[PDB]
Structures are given as structure tokens and as C-alpha cells.
Amino acid sequence: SEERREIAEVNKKLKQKNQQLKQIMDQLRNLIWDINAMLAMRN
């Protein structure tokens, strides 16, 4: 029964880890899109 609580612990842990990874991924996406747009318009 304690292993269920262990499961819930690690589930909450990587829930938070996945949301932080989503924020990192969104900021990288936006930086790539901005770089490509700004460099596309220079010509």
C-alpha cells in the first residue's frame, strides 16, 4: 500500500518536471521562430 503512495509521489514529481520542461520547450520554440522571422525579413 505504501508503494501506491510511492507511485503518487513520483507521479507528482515528474508532473512538475514535465510542466517545467514544457515551459523550456515553448521558450525555445518561440526563440527559433523569432530568429527565423527576423532573419527572413532582412533580404
Partner 1 sequence: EAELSAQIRYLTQVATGQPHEGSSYSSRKDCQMALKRVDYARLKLSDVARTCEQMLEN
Interaction site with partner 1 (CB under 8 A): 16-17, 20-21, 23-24, 27-28, 30-31, 34-35, 38-39, 42
Sign of CA pseudo-dihedral 36, 38, 41, 43: negative
For partner 1, give the closer residue by CB, 1 or 11. 11
CA distances from 16 to 10, 22, 31 (A): 10, 10, 23
Q: How far is the CB of 43 from partner 1 (least distance, A)?
A: 11
For partner 1, give the closer residue by CB, 4 or 40. 40
